[PDB]
Paper text:
pmcATP-binding cassette (ABC) transporters are ubiquitous membrane proteins that couple the energy of ATP binding and hydrolysis to the translocation of a wide variety of molecules across biological membranes. Here, we investigated whether a large separation of the nucleotide-binding domains is required for the transport cycle of BmrA, a homodimeric multidrug ABC transporter from Bacillus subtilis. Upon ATP binding, the NBDs engage in a transient tight dimer where the two nucleotides are sandwiched between the Walker A motif from one NBD and the ABC signature motif from the other NBD, thereby generating the OF conformation that is prone to drug release. Overall, our data suggest that the NBDs of BmrA function with a tweezers-like mechanism distinct from the related lipid A exporter MsbA.
In order to rule out the possibility that the disulfide bond restrained a wider opening of BmrA, we also determined by cryo-EM the structure of the WT protein in the resting state at a resolution of 3.16 Å. The C-terminal domain of the transporter appears more flexible than the rest of the protein, and residues 578 onward could not be modeled. And on Movie S1, the structure of WT BmrA is highly similar to that of the A582C cross-linked mutant (rmsd of 0.86 Å over 931 residues). Both structures adopt an IF conformation where the whole NBDs are moderately separated. The transmembrane helices are perfectly superposed (rmsd of 0.45 Å over 549 residues) while the NBDs are slightly less separated in the mutant structure. However this difference is minimal and represents only 1.4 to 2.2 Å when comparing the Cα position of residues K351, K380, Q483, and H535 from the NBD conserved motifs (A-loop, Walker A motif, ABC signature, and H-loop, respectively) between the WT and the mutant proteins. In the absence of ligand, the distance between the spins was outside of measurable range (>60 Å), consistent with the BmrA IF cryo-EM structure where the Cα of the two cysteines are separated by 65 Å. By generating a molecular morph between the IF and OF conformations of WT BmrA, we found that the NBDs of the transporter can function according to a tweezers-like motion. In comparison, the NBDs of BmrA monomers are well aligned and dimerize in a single translation. Finally, we solved the first IF structure of BmrA, providing not only a structural framework for further experimental studies but also complementing the previously published OF structures of BmrA to further understand the molecular details of the alternating access transport mechanism.
Residue numbers in the entry:
A (entry chain A), B (entry chain B): 10 to 577
The structure:
Amino acid sequence: SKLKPFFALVRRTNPSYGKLAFALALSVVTTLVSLLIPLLTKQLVDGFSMSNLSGTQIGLIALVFFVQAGLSAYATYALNYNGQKIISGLRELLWKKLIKLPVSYFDTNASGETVSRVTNDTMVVKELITTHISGFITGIISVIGSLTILFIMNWKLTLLVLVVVPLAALILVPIGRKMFSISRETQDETARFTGLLNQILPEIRLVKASNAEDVEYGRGKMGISSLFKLGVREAKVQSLVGPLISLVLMAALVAVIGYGGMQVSSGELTAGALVAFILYLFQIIMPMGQITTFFTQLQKSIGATERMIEILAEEEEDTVTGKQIENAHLPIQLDRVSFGYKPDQLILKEVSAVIEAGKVTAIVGPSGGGKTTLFKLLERFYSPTAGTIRLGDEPVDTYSLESWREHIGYVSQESPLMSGTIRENICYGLERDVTDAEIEKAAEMAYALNFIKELPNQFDTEVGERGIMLSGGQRQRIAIARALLRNPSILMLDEATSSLDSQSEKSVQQALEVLMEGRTTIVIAHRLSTVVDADQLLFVEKGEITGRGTHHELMASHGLYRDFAEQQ
Amino acid sequence: SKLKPFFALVRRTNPSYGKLAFALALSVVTTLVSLLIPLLTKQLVDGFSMSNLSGTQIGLIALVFFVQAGLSAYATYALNYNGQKIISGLRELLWKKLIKLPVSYFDTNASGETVSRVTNDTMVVKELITTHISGFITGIISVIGSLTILFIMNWKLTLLVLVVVPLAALILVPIGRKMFSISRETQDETARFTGLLNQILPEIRLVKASNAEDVEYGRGKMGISSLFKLGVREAKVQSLVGPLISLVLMAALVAVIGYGGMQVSSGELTAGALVAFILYLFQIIMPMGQITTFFTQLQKSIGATERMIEILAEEEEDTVTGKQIENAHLPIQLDRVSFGYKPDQLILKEVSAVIEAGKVTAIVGPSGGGKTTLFKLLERFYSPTAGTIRLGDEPVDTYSLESWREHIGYVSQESPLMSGTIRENICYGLERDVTDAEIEKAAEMAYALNFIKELPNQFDTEVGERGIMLSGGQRQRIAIARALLRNPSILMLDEATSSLDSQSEKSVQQALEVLMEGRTTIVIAHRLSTVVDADQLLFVEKGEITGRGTHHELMASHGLYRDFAEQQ
């Protein structure tokens, strides 16, 4: 059952299984050559009883060490290479998924955690493919192959190892886990004290103004006393754990190596068979660590595969389906539309309005009262739960999101400065073979050109978390230049959520005034005073509405919530 | 030279050196008993040539293992205990230093880094005292004692080990450092990609609005391609490093164990001497790790001692020197006073003013222009560079800071909520044997009592980063209750630096109005509108002054910087 998704996740990378198979095979053949070195050494050590060295025996041991190293090296490369080509394929698939997910995905799921998916979870599967599967398979063959040769070569000394090794681990493992618990307990008390000092030192002015220097000292002195009473328990425990580990491990070693030595002097064994036995003990006790490592890792890695195949399961945003748009200079309408993240818990209910062509229609109201939902529905960031948004005759789901997002233009005042060249940020995603004669003219109209020419180069600069960093009206003008160069029919303007005051007003207000001409403009307001001269203003509260006029017309004709004209 | 401060830092803890000496001694005696186990094993293995076991030989090997473990355990305890008693003493000394440093210490030096001093640096010295010094000393005796017995027992097989062990390390160490460089290079490229995805995913709305989904994918695809071209270099390198480590380590093991085996069959050695030789190889190759560990650690630890003895070198705030105060209901004056952190770079120059008894005197001006320095001088948080602050006749440095800080009362509106009981926060540092009949009455006057009785208990609650958390006018009223219960003559009121708007105004303004009666009140303003009705108002700009009137009197009579009455 449980391993079914892991091979389905690997298969879709086109992994060329013949090359992985061979690499695994060579890993096995290498391990069977490790078992032969101590038998060649037995033949050397026993043969030297006639004490002239047969030079061909020590040459054959060296030749087998070099063949061992060649097959180990090719196998290690082959595993690594093929694993690196799988990880890159998974990366690729997660990336193109991520990049096309509905943007609502990102509301529910933390961006930085998503990135961890791509980066970390892929790594975890790499380790299994490259390292742990081979390590397991080879480890098993090494341990069983060592013990089956040992049992044929001397059974009594093997039975002693099969008693001593688990009887030692039966004593060491309970002791290891108890010792580790006291280490963790001491780290938690150290964090608790560190937190006591970290709260007293920023308060130090009040501590001194109060004459409280003696009482804070007494309370810190209590905190070093609990660290001391805990540290003397760690000292008591570790004084039994330390010498008990040394006693059990050498007593085991003295019993095994010493009983083998007693058989050689007794005549029950040869000096070469003791040399072979000592060489196989490394080939048992060392790859037992890679065996346990496999099980250790598989527990976390299997979760990682479910954690990724999750992602690849998600719905993509279908941008291409439906009609292409023409003549978007038509009245938008919302027709008794609703929205919510559940069928019951509506954020917006049965709302109706028209948004006229070549007109300005501002959106306003109390925070959380519904404004952001009405705007995200018109920006098609969300799809409505019932009713239709319309564009003249047709419901807007008639039209391709790729075509809708070519006719709208988005500008946020709390503007994100994405990393790149100052020109590329003015034609971002605008695949039209654009020339600097046009890019300059868009920067002119945006009142950016005179500032751009002030930067280190006449028309280049790198910006973002790298290069030049820009504030307020400098980033906002290159955004208005991007908007201007795209030629939108509908403009969708997002005021600052963090509620900053506007900067260098005369330039950015003039840049907007040239962007807005002839454009159907929808704007969402975080303070009411920024939109008061609009042709139409919409007031949204508790997922319902009352505003359907210009500001002074509504303030005269309706006035049921005059308070928001006082709070502003 | 370099170790001189380390023993001076340890000595002042009163470390009872006789007990450390003995513990070290027992560590040595234990190590000399480790060297005897393989000689008793040699005698057993050689004696079994007449193949009836002398039961007293295997009893004597067991008795020496139990004496070894007893002396190891007592020594390990003794080192740990004594080390735990040193660390607690250092902790104690750093703490009482820290707690009494001039508060200006905390402007220059980061609080959280200071805490690290206490916590981490002390730990580093503990490891040296408990673990590393003994480890070194014992390690040396173990390695030299093993090699001197080996050279007496069989010299030829010792010379082979003295050639093979360094010739192996001469090949493995350059290879280890090259491999580690490629591991670090791959971690830095992984961080660079993770940073590329982490900047594109929060921008995803702009990516989708722009139709930029294809270009962002292409740029992420470039980032997985550089990770692939780097990972296939790590694969090339590791395919040579992996099998070369296995080749050199077993070829060394086959040469040493195999040449020893050839001497036993040749007649140049006995089976028991080979068993002793194999048992000493663990006692050489294992404590070489603790030797290198010592040097590794000492490099960081010696720095740690200079890093602490630093601290203990600092000037303490002398709170006790000079006169005690009586009748502080006298005009404060500043007499041609100055301040700065350097003799040249004055923050305040030759300023003169009187602050009348039973009067209110507010401090105002542009940010960074000098206001905070004039206030911190009156709060005696700083000492003036020239001239004197005075209290009636005498310069204020006549009086004990412990007595001055009993006659002033400090209240900050951006109030720190220090951790503790809701009653103890109202009598913090007020050592007078106070009773709940008084604490209640102070909470009444502060308009806190009616809120306190609303909490989970009638007059208890734990507060801080634990228990109940309180906002604005709730924490401010227990601060005004503390101020009220102390009976200040001078009140020193600090408005919010983060420029928050005031909350539940009618209660806190009434609480202040009852605190302020008959009190000489000095207040520092972050907005001018909060202090306009004061008896006196002081305007501070560029480290000089012009305001010396009440608000409307100054605004009429002077007006040289009317702009701050417009900016407010």
